[PDB]
Amino acid sequence: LGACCLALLQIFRSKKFPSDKLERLYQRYFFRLNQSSLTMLMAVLVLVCLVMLAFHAARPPLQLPYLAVLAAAVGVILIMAVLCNRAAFHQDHMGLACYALIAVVLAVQVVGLLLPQPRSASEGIWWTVFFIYTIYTLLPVRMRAAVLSGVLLSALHLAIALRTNAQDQFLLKQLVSNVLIFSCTNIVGVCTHYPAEVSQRQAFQETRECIQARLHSQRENQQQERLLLPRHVAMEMKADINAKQEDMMFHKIYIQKHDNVSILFADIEGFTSLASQCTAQELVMTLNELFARFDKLAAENHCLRIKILGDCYYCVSGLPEARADHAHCCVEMGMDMIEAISLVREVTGVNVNMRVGIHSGRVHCGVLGLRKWQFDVWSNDVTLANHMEAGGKAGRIHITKATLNYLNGDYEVEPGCGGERNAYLKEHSIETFLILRCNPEDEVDEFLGRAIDARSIDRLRSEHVRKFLLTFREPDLEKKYSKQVDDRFGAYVACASLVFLFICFVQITIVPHSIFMLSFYLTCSLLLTLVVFVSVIYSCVKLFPSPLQTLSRKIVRSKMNSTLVGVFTITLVFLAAFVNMFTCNSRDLLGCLAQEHNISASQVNACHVAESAVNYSLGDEQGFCGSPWPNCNFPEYFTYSVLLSLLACSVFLQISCIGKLVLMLAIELIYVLIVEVPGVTLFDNADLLVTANAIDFFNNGTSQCPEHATKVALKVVTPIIISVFVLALYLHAQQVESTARLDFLWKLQATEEKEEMEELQAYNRRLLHNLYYQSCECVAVMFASIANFSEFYVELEANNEGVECLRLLNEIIADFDEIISEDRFRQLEKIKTIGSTYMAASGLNDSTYDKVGKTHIKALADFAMKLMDQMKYINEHSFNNFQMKIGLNIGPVVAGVIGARKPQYDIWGNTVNVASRMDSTGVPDRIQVTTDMYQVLAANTYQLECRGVVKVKGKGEMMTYFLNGGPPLS
Amino acid sequence: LGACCLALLQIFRSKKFPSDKLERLYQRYFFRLNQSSLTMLMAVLVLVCLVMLAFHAARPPLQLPYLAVLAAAVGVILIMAVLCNRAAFHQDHMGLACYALIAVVLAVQVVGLLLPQPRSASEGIWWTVFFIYTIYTLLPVRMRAAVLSGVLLSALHLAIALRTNAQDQFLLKQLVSNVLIFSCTNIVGVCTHYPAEVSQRQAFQETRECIQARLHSQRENQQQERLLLPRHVAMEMKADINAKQEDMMFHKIYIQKHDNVSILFADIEGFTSLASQCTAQELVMTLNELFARFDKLAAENHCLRIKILGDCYYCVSGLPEARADHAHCCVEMGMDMIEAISLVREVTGVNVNMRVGIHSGRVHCGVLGLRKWQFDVWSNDVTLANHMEAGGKAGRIHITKATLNYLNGDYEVEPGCGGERNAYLKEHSIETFLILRCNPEDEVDEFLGRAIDARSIDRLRSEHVRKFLLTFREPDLEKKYSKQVDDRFGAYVACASLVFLFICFVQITIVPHSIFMLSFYLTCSLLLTLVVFVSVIYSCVKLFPSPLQTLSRKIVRSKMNSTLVGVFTITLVFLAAFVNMFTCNSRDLLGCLAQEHNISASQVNACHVAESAVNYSLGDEQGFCGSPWPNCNFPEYFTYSVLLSLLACSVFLQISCIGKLVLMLAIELIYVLIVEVPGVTLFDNADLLVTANAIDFFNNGTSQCPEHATKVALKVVTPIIISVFVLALYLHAQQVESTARLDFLWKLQATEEKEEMEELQAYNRRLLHNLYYQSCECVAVMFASIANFSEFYVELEANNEGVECLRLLNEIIADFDEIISEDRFRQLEKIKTIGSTYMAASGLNDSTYDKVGKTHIKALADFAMKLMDQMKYINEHSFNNFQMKIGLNIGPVVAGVIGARKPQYDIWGNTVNVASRMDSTGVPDRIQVTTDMYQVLAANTYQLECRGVVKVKGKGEMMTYFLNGGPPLS
């Protein structure tokens, strides 16, 4: 009883979007959408004003101020409509234009209510109700301003009628009914305005929902794509994914040949000592600073960094665009690298130096494998460049004869004696030289603004809907729109039931109480209450038994059933509006006065009535002239009740505009036929009696009445009023339906582009499956290497110089990328491939890192075993004998992305180096694990064999184990 | 006087498209477009029938047959509208449906004209005029059928009025005026139907124009593309042209590497002897049969033909898709080739044989140059395969050790001793073996039909036009539509002037001659004649002085000015229609009869009038009751005249439907206001007099007249009739505008897709610039070879194995393709490139072959010199010393396209072989010409040097000359 009132007071806090920028953008949309609505509003208000002018002009005396004030109001409204139709009128003033329009309407009301003759409390109700409803429905004003305007118009009408008509004994009945009418009009308009203002905000807010999700999902893809990523390879792959090349006998290799390249390898001499003394953080910081300096020198020297191999930085000049100075570029890069590492030695105090090997030759460059794609280069010339680095001297650039030939002698070189330091350079007798000396929300709002601007509203409306039928041109669009369900239907039914209660109270106050009338109204009330109950069961499903819950859901979930119930409700209200009118008197009073006065009807004036008024007055509820039926002196309130019923058609906003039109035209035709055909005698009697009562009958010594009807025949006025209301309701229904359909259409485009974007994200993510820093204390790392793949890799013409071998390695990596895709390995992430080496780790992602069970370690051991079995399977099916080594270790690492312009995700730390040494020291077809990994796997019933003490570079002697089998399958 | 009548009789031949299939397709379009028009027609005819029913039902006695016949007509029309609204009703019956509708309309007319009471010659004119105009404008019937129906309806009305009203003395005036009205309606309808029936055919015919051009231009591109054309290269190039890679420092090379190929060269031993004995026709026929047989064997043996080199056929197995049996494929191809040439020797009697060389290795395959692109292969392995052919034995397959290794020993081989027969095979110590033993119009109409079906008409209408404004949604679309000009406007002005003349004759026949009336009509006639003159000046510009021609063009070329003139004309016609009505009497006759009989107006009946009928009759043209103004007994013909003016609005078809609506509503409002407000006394007086005259006054012994008005008050009927006409004219204007806009929209899509297709054709042709047989008696042929390019071509890694050399040769060919693009060389066509050899010819195209001056030969010599200068320029800028040889010869050749599945355009004949020997024998940096070319150039003041006698294979000793310089530039 009090909580409901508090909730109602909570409703009266005008909902507003908190952001004034977002509210401004919403207002810009709403004003762009409603500029046409505002101009249609102005045109309909002009039409109604012209109807009032015609009604008042049909009967003199013409008061000059009335005509002048109406003409001025029309002029102002037309000027404002022309300004608002010029595109240069700012939309922020449309709100002011609405308040100005309200003020114009206020002025029209005052002259509308004071001057008209004859004076009556029934005059001008119809146009006041019209203007109220139109301000609630066609005027885009704020809730507080709409309510204030409607209340002001109502109180001013009542006060004027009280001042002008204070002399009528029955004034109170009229006044009460006018109060009741205005109360009804004040209610229904709120119940029409408030849900619409809510659903449009909801439709706008729901749109901002989905669009944000769209942008959010794009935002998630962006950083992905960022950290993910050559643009040509990435765009080719993006085209190929669009090709959806399922059912290919081979995985597409992405290889391009480039010759005339120079390959530089540069290794940090002594780095393992620094990395054995620095912490993981200090080590990664020093490495990232050093490699960012080398990345800069490489960009300045037009050298493409290919990969980092521990301490070794390697880059190629002449990729992807061939260049003639590639050898000079690589030599200068190697010099600047040696200078940069000398500076790093001077700053850090760590005696680091750099060996640089440079070869010049040819390479195939491209990507292999399915996952963790990296751009790499393959050739015998790359192997020679590597041996040239390994045979180089620290602080010196060691170059091949090929490079020297590309240097055109621009650099002083000494014999490098590389074959004294490198076995490969000796066996191949490679002539070698040493160089001596030469806000997201603001972006969302901007994108949405641009889309609102580019998604023009009248064009989208005209494009995605048929011209006249207003159905979507696509049947599927209409089926989607027909699937949109309402939930406030029961609130509209409740409002209609309250309007019914007001109608009942009006009828009980004006119309004498009849047992037939009371029984009929009771029956209609019971039916309406039953329909309200059945509709509310949908809102209160949990409180009612299953069959009623199913019926209520089947009604509200069925737009057809709710539409039928609405139509039935409206038809019942109309029947209640006139079935009692059939109990009004129908005997002719005018022939009766003709018989008493014995005068001709065309000579009967209200004065001849006043001569015999002793016998017949409006105060008689008994059927005059011996009629058994009572007189109904105020039938215009049935018309007003029908106006209320027409207003009730407004409340069912979701009835089709054609369905509304048909229902309203049927109500109009039936009521006009009942007013004209059977009611004409009642109306003529009432018009005559009202005309006599309008005469302030006083000492009329002579039978000189004011004459002139002074009013347009009410039988003629009622149809015109009804037709004008039906027109305005049709235009309102058209605007409402066009608005809901446009909001729906934009919500659909937002959803379709979002679904397309989610598909594209899933697409790019599938192909990938097919400063940011983090310290991770417990990562498990696996290296799995094909030990004899270097024996299988033969660069002969018969083997496409080895490209076919690279295809087979791709398949070997693809199998491994498929295995590592098993849900049981979702805790594992592939880091990279390196030649024939598969690198995986576990525990790098908090969403899969079990702090307690270290399950990711079990998953990594099971993956290593499943890889060994996949290698067996590959050997069996490819007729090869690939022997695989796997090194496992556990421990802390630093993960991060290096390169602001080429973000590479990677992991650094002693744990990775130890894992790589466990792989390098692995026995073929055996899984080598560290002592810590042995301890973890043995604690989990893994079968592990002690390999013994292995000499690990940078660690000395380390105990190592073989993992020979998993725990028994439970 | 007679030639104009003959031209008019030529107009009366109903235009029909000759093809019944094309006419059927047009009818299918027209019926699909007009199915909605036909249903709107049915609805408007129903509306008019309901108006007639209301007018006749407003006054008893109700004759049962009238009601029954109208109800049956309505039923039939509704049934037909429902059938035609079912998609399953065949469109061929719509024409019959129209004739059936005419028959229904005919039935409605008969009962419309016989039964109505009271009888008058003015009754039912309005609905007859409506039905006539609607049949001319909304009924899609053939011209002969429309004319026959309108004439039948007119004659039947006149015959009925003559039979029923033969007793009325003034009948002739009414009958003449009815004749005039119906004459106008018969004319104006033709003048509306005939231009429309013409413009729609024109709009359809003009569309078949542009679409044919589109298809025609596609057709021209098709054979081009056919003869033009690997699909992968062609599609990549097609993508690249879409890239519009302007501003690239290098021309994109299209090279793909393939390893594991087998290369077969097969040369015809002795062919030069046959080619020295056969005629050009017999030679080309024999060659084309032989090479078509080899093309077949190559397709069967999965060997790709790369090129034909004189008598030599060469093909590669393993291209473009690698295959393991490539060596076996090439060996079997060489066997089948040796068998096929043995069979050709047996059939032709010519002792031809074949040498076959097969190597197995690697190739780069691709396209070089800019013009006359051919798929080729480059590698040392191709050169070795060629030397293996040249070192082969005729009738034997000579294979390398590489091929033998790929044959897995499946073939018996002997030592080939290739190094004994080929120097290259000896120097490279290549181990070699010899194998011992193992209708366009119908396509146009179909494409157009498919486009008509896919270009649905109600959807296209709803998509490319705004719902209410009917303006094209894009302003540029509206600007194109606004640029569409009228050309028959002057014919419409002439028709409106003829309608004006008919109106004048009606007014002069019914309305007494007044100096004011005659002067006003004269003034309007002079103004209208001036407007007609100014409009015809547009049609007859040549006959009138320049200022009037400029005014007329500025009016007709300006849709605003022509629209203004149309509006002005219509306003003048309306003024002529009623300004004279202001000279009709205005004193009230009814109050006058009230004064004469001393009875109350409500007691004045036609019997009381007949008591005083002696003083007031319709025969009095002198103002009754002392008015100085004459009586106008038939004011309904002003209404009918206004109907004619509304029909005149139809004639100005191009007035905007909103502009027409506004003009017609202004005409309606003004005329209805003049009928109701000032004329009411005149109309009441006329209704009373006409009611008395309708009574066949006879011995009415008692004042018991037939009573009952029997007619709806004409003041009330006229507004309803006018509003119905305005509605029907609005709907007609809406259908007309929607039709013209749809025809325009399809014409636009046809033109835009045609322009896009012409762009695509120009595009493909630019990239090309960037059995079919012909015997050509006099062709000039040039070969220009870079003599030392084989010394520059180094397949070292430092040169991308020669790809960079192939890029430089591309630029050399690009310069040559640019030079040969000079307009002065438009008589020259590049035939092909062959390695570093540029092949050009002149006189191969009859449109550029100067038969008399042989200018194409001069252009070819000037091209050869310009190439020598371009080679100098290239040498200067590339720091090379490329020496060019050019061989020129003239003589007959056979041109043709060989290969039904790979059409290659080429030229054969002794002239080409001699030109190629002049190039092969050319001195570096010298142009060698034959004696015939020397004779032609010397006759044209070219500077030529005698080289002397050169030994030409197959010709013996031939005199040859050097061309050292061109004729002096004039």
Residues 6+ apart with CB under 8 A from A960: A918, A921, A928, A929, A930, A931, A947, A948, A949, A950
Tokens representing residue A386 in the block:
């590597």
Nearest CA in chain A to B475: A459
Q: What distance in Å separates the CA atoms of residue B730 and residue B668, rounded to the nearest whole number?
A: 13
B77 noted as active-site residue: no
For chain A, the first-to-last Cα distance in angstroms comes to 63
What CA–CA distances, in Å, run from A829 to A822, B406, B709?
11, 44, 101
For chain B, the first-to-last Cα distance in angstroms comes to 64
Q: How many residues can be counted in chain B?
A: 970
Per DSSP, the residues of A268-321 read EETHHHHHHHS-HHHHHHHHHHHHHHHHHHHHHTT-EEEEEETTEEEEEES-SS
Whether B364 contacts A800, CB under 8 Å:
no
Residues 6+ apart with CB under 8 A from B499: B184, B187, B188, B573, B644, B647, B648, B651
Per DSSP, A923 falls in state P
Tell me the residues of chain B between 792 and 811 that have a Cβ less than 8 Å away from chain A. 797-801, 803-804
Q: Contact A259/B797, CB-based, under 8 Å? A: yes
In which residue are the tokens 């003759």 written? Answer: A117
Task: Tell me how many degrees the CA angle B103-B107-B112 measures, rounded to the nearest 5.
Answer: 140
Q: Contact B260/A322, CB-based, under 8 Å? A: no
For residue B956, the SS3 value is strand
**Of residues B181, B211, B267, B308, which has the active-site annotation?**
B267
Tokens representing residue B481 in the block:
């539509």
CB atoms within 10 A of CB B564: 12
Whether A102 contacts A141, CB under 8 Å:
yes
Q: Contact A406/B798, CB-based, under 8 Å? A: yes
The phi, psi pair for B599, rounded to 5°, reads -120, 160
Residue type present at position A823: D
Residue type present at position B714: L
Q: What distance in Å separates the CA atoms of residue B38 and residue B447, rounded to the nearest whole number?
A: 28
Kindly tell me the sign of the dihedral angle through the C-alpha atoms of A770, A771, A776, A781: positive
Whether B919 contacts B885, CB under 8 Å:
yes
Q: Is B603 on the interface with A (CB under 8 A)?
A: no
Whether A341 contacts A297, CB under 8 Å:
no
Per DSSP, B394 falls in state B
Q: What distance in Å separates the CA atoms of residue A679 and residue A598, rounded to the nearest whole number?
A: 25
Q: For chain B, what are the domain ranges?
A: 19-213+457-756, 248-437, 771-965
Q: Could you tell me how far CA B44 lies from the centroid of its own chain?
A: 35
What CA–CA distances, in Å, run from A491 to A132, A188, A535, B551?
21, 11, 9, 69
Whether A334 contacts A317, CB under 8 Å:
no
Per DSSP, the residues of B71-123 read HHHHHHHHHHHHHHHSTTS-THHHHHHHHHHHHHHHHHHHHHHHS-SS--SST
A259-279 burial string, b = 16+ CB within 10 Å, else e?
bbbbbbbbbbbebeebbeebe
- Catalytic residue IDs of A: 267-268, 311
Q: What distance in Å separates the CA atoms of residue B229 and residue B252, rounded to the nearest whole number?
A: 19
Residues 6+ apart with CB under 8 A from A762: none
Contacts of B458 in chain A (CB under 8 A): 466
Q: Is A362 on the interface with B (CB under 8 A)?
A: yes
Q: What distance in Å separates the CA atoms of residue A653 and residue A837, rounded to the nearest whole number?
A: 68
Residue type present at position A938: A
Q: Contact B798/A259, CB-based, under 8 Å? A: yes
Whether A784 contacts A886, CB under 8 Å:
yes
Q: What distance in Å separates the CA atoms of residue A241 and residue A610, rounded to the nearest whole number?
A: 97
Q: How many residues can be counted in chain A?
A: 970
Tokens representing residue A941 in the block:
């019933």
Q: What distance in Å separates the CA atoms of residue B915 and residue B888, rounded to the nearest whole number?
A: 5
Residue type present at position A680: V
CB atoms within 10 A of CB B820: 22
Tokens representing residue B392 in the block:
């082969």
**Of residues B168, B311, B325, B919, which has the active-site annotation?**
B311
Whether B435 contacts B399, CB under 8 Å:
yes
Q: Could you tell me how far CA A855 lies from the centroid of its own chain?
A: 39
CATH superfamily of A255-437: Nucleotide cyclase, GGDEF domain (3.30.70.1230)
Q: Contact B473/A463, CB-based, under 8 Å? A: yes
Q: What distance in Å separates the CA atoms of residue A613 and residue B589, rounded to the nearest whole number?
A: 39
Q: Could you tell me how far CA B653 lies from the centroid of its own chain?
A: 25
CB atoms within 10 A of CB B915: 30
Nearest Cα residue to B137 out of B177, B197, B65, B178 = B197
Whether B648 contacts B133, CB under 8 Å:
no
Q: What is the 3-state secondary structure (H, E, C) of A87-137?
A: CCCCCHHHHHHHHHHHHHHHHHHHHHHHCCCCCCCCCCHHHHHHHHHHHHH
Q: What distance in Å separates the CA atoms of residue A683 and residue A663, rounded to the nearest whole number?
A: 26
Contacts of B476 in chain A (CB under 8 A): none
Q: What distance in Å separates the CA atoms of residue A94 and residue A79, rounded to the nearest whole number?
A: 14
Tell me the shortest Cα–Cα distance from B283 to chain A, in angstroms: 41
Tokens representing residue B334 in the block:
């060489």
For residue B379, the SS3 value is coil
CB atoms within 10 A of CB B293: 16
Q: What distance in Å separates the CA atoms of residue A583 and residue A580, rounded to the nearest whole number?
A: 5
The phi, psi pair for A312, rounded to 5°, reads -85, 125
CB atoms within 10 A of CB B509: 13
- Count of alpha carbons within 13 Å of A917, Cβ hemisphere only? 21
The phi, psi pair for A272, rounded to 5°, reads -60, -30
Nearest Cα residue to A129 out of A94, A157, A160, A162 = A157
A921-931 burial string, b = 16+ CB within 10 Å, else e?
bbeebbbbbbe
Nearest Cα residue to B405 out of B351, B483, B324, B343 = B324
Q: What distance in Å separates the CA atoms of residue A106 and residue A125, rounded to the nearest whole number?
A: 15
Whether A753 contacts A454, CB under 8 Å:
no
Whether A428 contacts A418, CB under 8 Å:
no
In which residue are the tokens 């029913």 written? Answer: B53
Nearest Cα residue to A918 out of A893, A949, A952, A943 = A952
Q: Could you tell me how far CA A140 lies from the centroid of its own chain?
A: 25
Nearest Cα residue to B302 out of B283, B324, B318, B284 = B318
Tell me the shortest Cα–Cα distance from A422 to chain B, in angstroms: 24
Cis preceding linkage at A545, omega within 30: no
Per DSSP, B827 falls in state T
Q: What distance in Å separates the CA atoms of residue B522 and residue A501, rounded to the nearest whole number?
A: 72
For chain A, after which residues does the C atom lie more than 2.5 Å from the next written residue's N, i.e. where is it broken?
229, 438, 770
Among the residues of A703-713, which ranges form H helices?
A: none
Q: Is B144 on the interface with A (CB under 8 A)?
A: no
By CB atoms closer than 10 A (0-12, 13-18, 19+), residue B108 is buried
The phi, psi pair for A907, rounded to 5°, reads -130, 135
Nearest Cα residue to B894 out of B275, B443, B369 = B275
Reading phi first (left if > 0) and then psi (alpha if -120 to 50, else beta), residue B958 is in beta
Residues 6+ apart with CB under 8 A from B899: B292, B295
Tell me the residues of chain A between 319 and 358 that have a Cβ less than 8 Å away from chain B. 322
Same fold, A255-437 and A771-965: yes
- Count of alpha carbons within 13 Å of B635, Cβ hemisphere only? 32
Q: Contact B463/A466, CB-based, under 8 Å? A: no
Return the H-helix or E-strand segment holding B312.
strand B312-317
Nearest Cα residue to B406 out of B437, B348, B362 = B362
Which residues of B define the annotated binding site for ATP? 267-272, 309-311, 355, 832, 906-908, 913-917, 953
CB atoms within 10 A of CB A720: 15
Whether A682 contacts A635, CB under 8 Å:
yes
Q: Is B459 on the interface with A (CB under 8 A)?
A: yes
Q: Could you tell me how far CA B378 lies from the centroid of its own chain?
A: 48
Nearest Cα residue to B716 out of B4, B55, B16, B31 = B55
CATH 3.60.15.10 fits B771-965, yes or no: no
Per DSSP, the residues of A584-635 read S--S-HHHHHHHHHT--GGG--HHHHHHSTTT--TT--S-GGG-SSPP-S-T
Q: What distance in Å separates the CA atoms of residue B647 and residue B665, rounded to the nearest whole number?
A: 13
Per DSSP, B323 falls in state -
Q: Which residue among A259, A458, A461 places its CB closest to the CB of B800?
A: A259
Tell me the shortest Cα–Cα distance from B18 to chain A, in angstroms: 37
Best A250, A253, A255, A260 member to test B by mutation, with max B CBs in 10 Å, is A260
CATH architecture for residues B248-437: 2-Layer Sandwich (3.30)
By CB atoms closer than 10 A (0-12, 13-18, 19+), residue A707 is exposed
Q: What distance in Å separates the CA atoms of residue B305 and residue A727, rounded to the nearest whole number?
A: 80
Per DSSP, B257 falls in state E
Q: What distance in Å separates the CA atoms of residue B354 and residue B390, rounded to the nearest whole number?
A: 11
3-state helix, strand, coil in chain A (%, to 5): 60, 15, 25
Whether B463 contacts A463, CB under 8 Å:
yes
Q: Is A406 on the interface with B (CB under 8 A)?
A: yes
Q: Is B296 on the interface with A (CB under 8 A)?
A: no
Q: What distance in Å separates the CA atoms of residue B509 and residue B499, rounded to the nearest whole number?
A: 15
Question: Resolution in angstroms, to 1 decimal, for this deposition?
Answer: 7.0
Which residues of B define the annotated binding site for Mg(2+)? 267-268, 311
Contacts of B467 in chain A (CB under 8 A): 461-462, 465, 467-468
Nearest CA in chain A to B601: A602
Residues 6+ apart with CB under 8 A from B299: B901
